[PDB]
Design a protein around this ligand. Structure first.
Ligand SMILES: *C(=O)N1C[C@H](NOS(=O)(=O)O)CC[C@H]1C(N)=O
Length: 246
Protein backbone atom coordinates (compact mmCIF):
# COMPACT_ATOMS: atom_id res chain seq x y z
CA UNK A 1 0.00 0.00 0.00
CA UNK A 2 2.86 2.33 0.90
CA UNK A 3 6.37 2.96 -0.41
CA UNK A 4 9.05 2.86 2.29
CA UNK A 5 11.89 5.34 2.02
CA UNK A 6 13.83 7.52 4.45
CA UNK A 7 15.11 10.09 1.97
CA UNK A 8 15.36 13.66 3.20
CA UNK A 9 13.19 16.27 1.53
CA UNK A 10 12.33 19.95 1.59
CA UNK A 11 8.77 20.47 2.83
CA UNK A 12 6.43 22.32 0.45
CA UNK A 13 3.45 22.64 2.78
CA UNK A 14 2.35 26.01 1.44
CA UNK A 15 1.38 24.36 -1.84
CA UNK A 16 -1.72 23.19 0.03
CA UNK A 17 -4.08 25.81 -1.49
CA UNK A 18 -3.60 24.40 -5.00
CA UNK A 19 -5.11 21.14 -3.71
CA UNK A 20 -8.42 22.57 -2.52
CA UNK A 21 -10.96 19.77 -2.66
CA UNK A 22 -8.45 16.91 -2.85
CA UNK A 23 -6.11 14.76 -0.82
CA UNK A 24 -3.11 15.47 -3.02
CA UNK A 25 0.65 15.33 -3.29
CA UNK A 26 3.34 17.09 -5.31
CA UNK A 27 6.86 15.63 -5.55
CA UNK A 28 9.80 17.41 -7.20
CA UNK A 29 13.31 16.06 -7.71
CA UNK A 30 16.09 18.51 -8.64
CA UNK A 31 18.70 16.51 -10.53
CA UNK A 32 21.71 18.81 -10.08
CA UNK A 33 21.10 19.33 -6.36
CA UNK A 34 20.10 15.65 -5.84
CA UNK A 35 17.21 16.94 -3.77
CA UNK A 36 13.55 16.09 -3.25
CA UNK A 37 10.85 18.61 -2.35
CA UNK A 38 7.41 17.33 -1.29
CA UNK A 39 3.94 18.62 -0.52
CA UNK A 40 2.06 16.05 1.61
CA UNK A 41 4.71 13.45 2.37
CA UNK A 42 2.15 10.85 3.58
CA UNK A 43 0.24 10.99 0.30
CA UNK A 44 3.54 11.04 -1.64
CA UNK A 45 4.23 7.48 -0.40
CA UNK A 46 0.69 6.08 -0.85
CA UNK A 47 0.43 3.80 -3.87
CA UNK A 48 -2.33 4.33 -6.42
CA UNK A 49 -3.27 2.77 -9.72
CA UNK A 50 -1.17 4.44 -12.45
CA UNK A 51 -3.91 4.25 -15.12
CA UNK A 52 -2.65 5.94 -18.31
CA UNK A 53 0.72 6.88 -16.82
CA UNK A 54 1.69 3.20 -17.16
CA UNK A 55 1.69 3.64 -20.96
CA UNK A 56 5.20 5.16 -20.65
CA UNK A 57 6.66 1.86 -19.47
CA UNK A 58 4.52 -0.38 -21.67
CA UNK A 59 5.97 1.59 -24.59
CA UNK A 60 9.53 1.03 -23.33
CA UNK A 61 8.97 -2.71 -22.73
CA UNK A 62 7.53 -2.95 -26.25
CA UNK A 63 10.60 -1.34 -27.81
CA UNK A 64 12.84 -3.58 -25.69
CA UNK A 65 10.98 -6.68 -26.93
CA UNK A 66 10.94 -5.40 -30.56
CA UNK A 67 7.17 -5.16 -30.74
CA UNK A 68 7.85 -1.53 -31.73
CA UNK A 69 10.85 -0.26 -33.73
CA UNK A 70 12.44 3.18 -33.85
CA UNK A 71 10.86 3.73 -37.28
CA UNK A 72 7.86 1.37 -36.99
CA UNK A 73 5.27 2.24 -34.32
CA UNK A 74 2.05 2.13 -36.38
CA UNK A 75 -0.93 0.02 -35.31
CA UNK A 76 -4.09 -0.48 -37.38
CA UNK A 77 -7.46 0.22 -35.77
CA UNK A 78 -9.65 -2.90 -35.69
CA UNK A 79 -12.88 -0.90 -36.28
CA UNK A 80 -14.26 -1.20 -32.72
CA UNK A 81 -16.30 1.96 -32.14
CA UNK A 82 -14.95 3.61 -29.00
CA UNK A 83 -16.72 6.59 -27.43
CA UNK A 84 -13.66 8.79 -28.18
CA UNK A 85 -13.39 9.38 -31.92
CA UNK A 86 -9.65 10.10 -31.52
CA UNK A 87 -9.34 6.37 -30.77
CA UNK A 88 -11.32 5.31 -33.85
CA UNK A 89 -8.43 5.53 -36.27
CA UNK A 90 -4.97 4.15 -36.94
CA UNK A 91 -2.25 5.21 -34.52
CA UNK A 92 1.48 5.54 -34.04
CA UNK A 93 3.38 6.03 -30.80
CA UNK A 94 2.98 9.83 -30.84
CA UNK A 95 -0.77 9.81 -31.53
CA UNK A 96 -1.46 6.96 -29.11
CA UNK A 97 0.29 8.87 -26.30
CA UNK A 98 -1.22 12.26 -27.19
CA UNK A 99 -4.77 10.87 -27.32
CA UNK A 100 -4.08 8.27 -24.58
CA UNK A 101 -5.39 5.47 -26.78
CA UNK A 102 -5.97 2.51 -24.48
CA UNK A 103 -6.24 -0.16 -27.18
CA UNK A 104 -2.77 0.65 -28.55
CA UNK A 105 -1.21 -0.15 -25.16
CA UNK A 106 -3.53 -3.06 -24.45
CA UNK A 107 -2.25 -4.59 -27.69
CA UNK A 108 1.33 -4.09 -26.51
CA UNK A 109 0.58 -5.78 -23.19
CA UNK A 110 -1.19 -8.65 -24.95
CA UNK A 111 2.00 -9.46 -26.88
CA UNK A 112 4.24 -9.33 -23.80
CA UNK A 113 4.53 -12.50 -21.76
CA UNK A 114 3.27 -11.67 -18.30
CA UNK A 115 6.36 -13.34 -16.84
CA UNK A 116 8.43 -10.83 -18.81
CA UNK A 117 6.29 -7.97 -17.50
CA UNK A 118 6.89 -9.17 -13.94
CA UNK A 119 10.62 -9.26 -14.63
CA UNK A 120 10.56 -5.70 -15.99
CA UNK A 121 8.52 -4.35 -13.06
CA UNK A 122 10.99 -6.02 -10.67
CA UNK A 123 13.96 -4.46 -12.47
CA UNK A 124 12.51 -0.92 -12.60
CA UNK A 125 10.88 -1.28 -9.16
CA UNK A 126 7.39 -0.33 -10.31
CA UNK A 127 5.47 0.19 -7.09
CA UNK A 128 3.86 -2.94 -5.69
CA UNK A 129 4.59 -4.85 -8.94
CA UNK A 130 1.19 -6.59 -8.64
CA UNK A 131 -0.22 -7.54 -12.04
CA UNK A 132 -2.65 -10.36 -11.22
CA UNK A 133 -5.84 -8.42 -10.55
CA UNK A 134 -7.17 -8.04 -14.09
CA UNK A 135 -6.00 -8.34 -17.69
CA UNK A 136 -5.73 -4.53 -17.62
CA UNK A 137 -3.95 -4.61 -14.27
CA UNK A 138 -2.85 -0.96 -14.57
CA UNK A 139 -6.42 0.42 -14.82
CA UNK A 140 -7.90 0.75 -11.33
CA UNK A 141 -6.75 -2.76 -10.50
CA UNK A 142 -3.90 -4.45 -8.65
CA UNK A 143 -0.87 -2.46 -9.84
CA UNK A 144 -0.17 0.63 -7.73
CA UNK A 145 2.66 3.16 -7.50
CA UNK A 146 3.33 6.25 -5.38
CA UNK A 147 4.10 9.80 -6.48
CA UNK A 148 7.69 9.65 -5.24
CA UNK A 149 8.16 6.36 -7.11
CA UNK A 150 6.78 7.90 -10.30
CA UNK A 151 9.47 10.57 -10.01
CA UNK A 152 12.15 7.99 -9.23
CA UNK A 153 11.33 5.96 -12.34
CA UNK A 154 11.32 8.99 -14.63
CA UNK A 155 14.73 10.04 -13.29
CA UNK A 156 16.13 6.50 -13.64
CA UNK A 157 14.81 6.39 -17.21
CA UNK A 158 16.26 9.77 -18.24
CA UNK A 159 19.54 9.18 -16.40
CA UNK A 160 19.95 5.95 -18.45
CA UNK A 161 19.88 3.74 -15.36
CA UNK A 162 17.25 1.41 -16.81
CA UNK A 163 18.14 -1.32 -19.27
CA UNK A 164 16.28 0.30 -22.15
CA UNK A 165 17.82 1.54 -25.39
CA UNK A 166 18.61 5.25 -25.32
CA UNK A 167 17.00 5.79 -28.73
CA UNK A 168 13.79 4.10 -27.52
CA UNK A 169 13.75 6.42 -24.51
CA UNK A 170 14.09 9.39 -26.87
CA UNK A 171 11.09 8.17 -28.87
CA UNK A 172 8.96 7.80 -25.73
CA UNK A 173 10.13 11.20 -24.46
CA UNK A 174 9.17 12.75 -27.82
CA UNK A 175 5.71 11.18 -27.63
CA UNK A 176 5.08 12.91 -24.27
CA UNK A 177 6.70 16.28 -25.13
CA UNK A 178 4.23 19.10 -24.43
CA UNK A 179 6.38 22.16 -25.12
CA UNK A 180 9.90 22.70 -26.43
CA UNK A 181 11.58 26.11 -26.31
CA UNK A 182 15.20 27.13 -26.51
CA UNK A 183 15.26 27.35 -22.70
CA UNK A 184 13.41 24.16 -21.77
CA UNK A 185 11.70 20.94 -22.81
CA UNK A 186 8.50 20.12 -20.91
CA UNK A 187 7.45 16.47 -20.86
CA UNK A 188 4.51 14.85 -19.14
CA UNK A 189 1.66 12.36 -19.06
CA UNK A 190 -1.79 12.40 -17.52
CA UNK A 191 -3.81 9.61 -15.99
CA UNK A 192 -7.36 9.25 -14.65
CA UNK A 193 -9.00 6.43 -12.71
CA UNK A 194 -12.77 5.94 -12.47
CA UNK A 195 -14.32 4.53 -9.29
CA UNK A 196 -18.11 4.28 -8.89
CA UNK A 197 -18.51 6.22 -12.16
CA UNK A 198 -16.57 9.21 -10.76
CA UNK A 199 -13.04 10.52 -11.33
CA UNK A 200 -11.33 9.43 -8.13
CA UNK A 201 -7.61 9.20 -9.03
CA UNK A 202 -5.73 11.82 -11.06
CA UNK A 203 -2.09 11.82 -12.14
CA UNK A 204 0.27 14.13 -13.96
CA UNK A 205 3.93 13.08 -14.06
CA UNK A 206 6.87 14.32 -16.08
CA UNK A 207 9.88 16.58 -16.11
CA UNK A 208 11.19 19.96 -17.22
CA UNK A 209 14.64 19.83 -18.79
CA UNK A 210 16.52 23.12 -18.86
CA UNK A 211 19.97 24.00 -20.21
CA UNK A 212 21.61 23.05 -16.89
CA UNK A 213 19.21 20.85 -14.90
CA UNK A 214 16.24 18.49 -14.98
CA UNK A 215 13.26 18.85 -12.63
CA UNK A 216 11.19 15.65 -12.29
CA UNK A 217 7.71 15.92 -10.85
CA UNK A 218 4.56 14.01 -10.02
CA UNK A 219 1.16 15.24 -8.90
CA UNK A 220 -1.47 12.94 -7.48
CA UNK A 221 -5.12 13.75 -6.69
CA UNK A 222 -7.45 11.62 -4.57
CA UNK A 223 -11.08 12.66 -4.30
CA UNK A 224 -14.63 11.42 -4.49
CA UNK A 225 -14.93 13.14 -7.88
CA UNK A 226 -13.17 15.55 -10.23
CA UNK A 227 -9.80 13.92 -9.45
CA UNK A 228 -8.53 13.53 -12.99
CA UNK A 229 -5.43 13.97 -15.09
CA UNK A 230 -6.50 17.32 -16.52
CA UNK A 231 -6.85 18.81 -13.03
CA UNK A 232 -3.58 17.22 -11.91
CA UNK A 233 -1.89 18.82 -14.92
CA UNK A 234 -3.50 22.23 -14.24
CA UNK A 235 -2.28 22.17 -10.64
CA UNK A 236 1.16 21.00 -11.75
CA UNK A 237 1.47 23.85 -14.25
CA UNK A 238 0.48 26.40 -11.60
CA UNK A 239 3.19 25.04 -9.28
CA UNK A 240 5.85 24.75 -11.98
CA UNK A 241 5.18 28.30 -13.17
CA UNK A 242 5.47 29.66 -9.64
CA UNK A 243 8.84 27.86 -9.51
CA UNK A 244 9.70 29.67 -12.77
CA UNK A 245 10.30 26.35 -14.52
CA UNK A 246 7.78 26.82 -17.34
C1 LIG B 1 -5.63 7.04 -18.71
O1 LIG B 1 -5.55 7.20 -17.51
N1 LIG B 1 -6.94 6.88 -19.34
C2 LIG B 1 -7.16 6.71 -20.78
C3 LIG B 1 -7.86 8.04 -21.25
N2 LIG B 1 -7.23 9.33 -21.03
O2 LIG B 1 -6.98 9.58 -19.73
S1 LIG B 1 -5.93 10.67 -19.53
O3 LIG B 1 -6.14 11.84 -20.45
O4 LIG B 1 -6.02 11.09 -18.05
O5 LIG B 1 -4.57 10.06 -19.67
C4 LIG B 1 -9.20 8.02 -20.55
C5 LIG B 1 -9.04 7.96 -19.04
C6 LIG B 1 -8.07 6.91 -18.47
C7 LIG B 1 -8.57 5.47 -18.32
N3 LIG B 1 -9.11 5.03 -17.07
O6 LIG B 1 -8.45 4.64 -19.22
Amino acid sequence: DKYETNVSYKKLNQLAPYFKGFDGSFVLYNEREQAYSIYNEPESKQRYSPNSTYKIYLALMAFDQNLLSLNHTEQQWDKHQYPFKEWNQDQNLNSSMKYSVNWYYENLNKHLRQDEVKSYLDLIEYGNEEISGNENYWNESSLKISAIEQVNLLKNMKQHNMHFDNKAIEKVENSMTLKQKDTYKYVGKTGTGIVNHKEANGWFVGYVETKDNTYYFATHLKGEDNANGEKAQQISERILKEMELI
